[PDB]
Amino acid sequence: MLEETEAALLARVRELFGATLRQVEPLTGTWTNEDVHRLFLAPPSVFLAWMGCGEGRTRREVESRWAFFVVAELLNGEPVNRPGIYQIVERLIAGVNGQTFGPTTGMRLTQVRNLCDDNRINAGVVLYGVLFSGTTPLPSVVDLDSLDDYERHWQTWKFPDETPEFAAHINVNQEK
Amino acid sequence: LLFDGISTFNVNDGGEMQIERMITMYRTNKYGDSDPSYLNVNTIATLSY
């Protein structure tokens, strides 16, 4: 159950920040060196990206690694609202730490990378990026349901192929 | 007779009559196969009790 966890994180971010963040949108792939010239950033906004999942404790759970890439504007080498972006980062860490989001539980902060190199400084964007790890379980085996009236029991004894056959066609629920 | 369904009796020395084994008439299931579940009168009496 991963898409449900992703939707829960997005809903939590929307509820916590509201109109402070211009938009929120799951981001395909991790942040590469081309995403800045490819995405509809519309800063300030945050993108939730699934960075895979490492082995969990059991064979039914994994340690999913998510990431929150925060975006803003740095016109003239000056962040658009430095208190605003710092508050956004801290509040996103606080509201998405420990608290469960759907099946995933135990959201633990792992790192907060600055992730602001030339490709993003020259494009007027800061990219403070949070990372998370969570104990998310795997879906259960799909159940089944069917009712057929038991009426026949065909049993065949496994003699050699050309040995004369031996079998019983019980045909239960027969009365006489 | 005990395998037919009819109970049998034993005559003791002196002429007294005794009960060999008193059984019901249950000898087959709903199918044609044999069934001992209700064979004994003791089974019926114990189930009723």
**What string of H, E and C letters represents the secondary structure of chain A?**
CCHHHHHHHHHHHHHHHCCCCCCEEECCCCCCCCHHHCCCCCCCEEEEEEEEEEECCCCCEEEEEEEEEEECCCHHHCCCCHHHHHHHHHHHHHHCCCCCECCEEEEEEEEEECCCCHHHHCCCCCCCEEEEEEEEECCCCCCCCCCCCCCCCEEEECCCCCCCCEEEECCCCCCC
Q: Exposed (0-12), middle (13-18) or buried (19+): which is A98, by Cβ within 10 Å?
A: exposed
Amino acid found at A134: G
User: Which of A25, A16, A23 is closest to A91 using CA atoms?
Assistant: A16
Cα–Cα distance, B23 to B8 (Å, whole number): 9
Cα–Cα distance, B47 to A12 (Å, whole number): 64
Cα–Cα distance, A95 to A68 (Å, whole number): 12
Query: What is the experimental resolution, given in Å to one decimal place?
Result: 3.8
In chain B, which residues have their Cβ closer than 8 Å to the Cβ of A176? 31-32
Q: Which residue is closest to A175 within chain B, CA to CA?
A: B31
Unique residue bearing structure tokens 């950033």: A41
Distance from CA of B5 to the nearest CA of A (A): 18
Q: Which residue is closest to B30 within chain A, CA to CA?
A: A175
Say what the alpha-carbon torsion angle A84, A88, A94, A100 is, to the nearest 10 degrees. 160
Q: Which residue is closest to A173 within chain B, CA to CA?
A: B31
Task: State the method.
Answer: cryo-EM
Distances in Å between the Cα of A126 and the Cα atoms of A17, A24, A85, A86, A168 are 18, 16, 9, 11, 78
- Looking at the DSSP bridge assignments, the partners of residue B34 are B28
Q: Is B33 on the interface with A (CB under 8 A)?
A: no
Unique residue bearing structure tokens 């509040």: A91
CA B5 to chain centroid, in Å, comes to 6
CA A105 to chain centroid, in Å, comes to 12
Interface of A with B in 114-173 (CB under 8 A): 172
